[PDB]
Point group: C2
Amino acid sequence: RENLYFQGMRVSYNKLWKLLIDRDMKKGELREAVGVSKSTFAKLGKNENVSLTVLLAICEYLNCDFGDIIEALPE
Amino acid sequence: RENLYFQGMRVSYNKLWKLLIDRDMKKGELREAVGVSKSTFAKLGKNENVSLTVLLAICEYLNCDFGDIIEALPE
């Protein structure tokens, strides 16, 4: 619906993977605790966008903030 | 579509407002440079969720990262 004039950056979930290892957790543990669907969760592995609702739920469960799980990178 | 088991946190855009003052910019300048629609942009003023696409566009224009513009807070 938006016609934005900046389209050159992409999400990265690298920090999330580092955090899970820091907590001794596997990605399926995160998926299942939070209730994220299989296809949405798969977007994380592909650095594809998910909703802020999903990201907020991950922050709530992990006791973290957005900058601990996502980064804006050049595409 | 998701049935998540964490629903207690909300986005906050407080850091974005601080950053705009740091850059001597007004919110309408940001809206118009990036091309965000009026109703989407209004969500920012209300701490309502917007797409990662919108947030990425703001990061690209401001040369910043997610943790410079959003925070996860208790609702």
